[PDB]
From a paper:
To express the loop region of human or yeast Ndc80c, as a recombinant heterodimer, we cloned codon-optimized synthetic genes (IDT) coding for [name] (residues 370–509 for human [name]) with a TEV protease-cleavable 6-His tag and [name] (residues 252–347 for human [name]) into the respective multiple cloning sites of pETDuet-1. To facilitate formation of the [name]-[name] heterodimer, we introduced four cysteine residues, two on the respective N and C termini of [name], and another two on those of [name]. We obtained crystals of the human complex in space group C2 (a = 49.9 Å, b = 72.3 Å, c = 80.1 Å, β = 98.56°). From merged datasets that extended to a minimum Bragg spacing of 2.0 Å, we determined the structure by molecular replacement with a four-part model based on the AF2 prediction (see Materials and Methods for details and for controls to eliminate model bias, electronic supplementary material, table S1 for data and refinement statistics, and electronic supplementary material, figure S1 for representative density maps). The final model agrees well with the predicted structure, consistent with the strength and robustness of the molecular replacement calculations. The [name] chain is a continuous helix opposite the entire switchback. The short, disordered segment in the human [name] structure corresponds (in the predictions) to the segment of Saccharomyces cerevisiae [name] containing the substitutions in a seven-alanine mutant shown to fail in the transition to end-on attachment in budding yeast. The two structures reported here are both examples of using AF2 predictions to generate hypotheses for constructs likely to yield informative structures. For example, to design the particular loop construct that yielded the structure shown in figure 2d, ambiguities of coiled-coil heptad matching would have required a series of alternative pairings of the two chains on both sides of the loop itself, and the pairing C-terminal to the [name] switchback is in fact half a heptad shifted from the best guess we had made previously, extrapolating from the structure of the four-way junction.
The bridge between centromere-associated kinetochore assemblies and spindle microtubules is the [name] complex (Ndc80c), a heterotetramer, conserved from yeast to mammals, with globular elements at both ends of an approximately 600 Å long, largely α-helical coiled-coil shaft. Closely paired calponin homology (CH) domains of [name] and [name] at one end, augmented by a flexible, N-terminal extension of [name], form a microtubule-attachment module. The coiled-coil shaft of [name] : [name] has two specializations—a kink or hinge at about 160 Å from the globular end and a so-called ‘loop’ at about 240 Å. At least three interactions involve subunits of the DASH/Dam1 complex (Dam1c, consisting of Ask1, Dad1, Dad2, Dad3, Dad4, Dam1, Duo1, Hsk3, Spc19 and Spc34), which coordinates end-on attachment of multiple Ndc80c rods around the splayed plus end of a kinetochore microtubule.
Residue numbers in the entry:
A (entry chain A): 1 to 143
B (entry chain B): 1 to 98
The structure:
Amino acid sequence: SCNHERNELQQTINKLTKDLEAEQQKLWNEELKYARGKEAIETQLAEYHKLARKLKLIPKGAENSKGYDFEIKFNPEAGANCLVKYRAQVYVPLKELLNETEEEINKALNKKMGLEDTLEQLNAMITESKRSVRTLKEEVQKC
Amino acid sequence: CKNYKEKMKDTVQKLKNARQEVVEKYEIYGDSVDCLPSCQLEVQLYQKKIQDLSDNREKLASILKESLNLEDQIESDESELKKLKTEENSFKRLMIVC
């Protein structure tokens, strides 16, 4: 009562005070992890935007952007999946530029191979014409 | 006795309440940290796609480049053949006027 209780209440104060300290430590720890995890994402985003600017997908109205906004903004504390939500804004127009490119590459390779076969045809015709000229040559001079 | 005992009774609740607030904030950052792996992966996939776009644009330019060179070759070879066929015909005529 005057001691048993009071003293038991004191030991609870002592325990709970150390328990609070441990939780204050855990919070600060997790805060710094989140900060490091962020910075790592901002660093990767800076590399993506650097190259995007090089390919002129950025800034807005860049000549290789087709009018899309390829800029991505990461803000402190965003709901679960801050960047996955950009899939419709940035990812589906990007895969569009990719498939338009590979198709245009297949049309170009189709044209190239056609020009290549035309050239081998001409080599065949030029080589046979040179033979005839050399043959008729000898026959004319044989007379 | 009830004066200090109440103070200690309030101190325990003040401590238990403070603990509950720190755990709450800790869990918010805990959940946020758990979502950053997905954010890291997303930026990786975007860097891949941009690099793929870059590489394929280089490939297209090279093909278009050489395709234009082959057009110049066809043009030249078409002249060489024209000349040869003209010479061929002339000698066929020379054979007759022998």
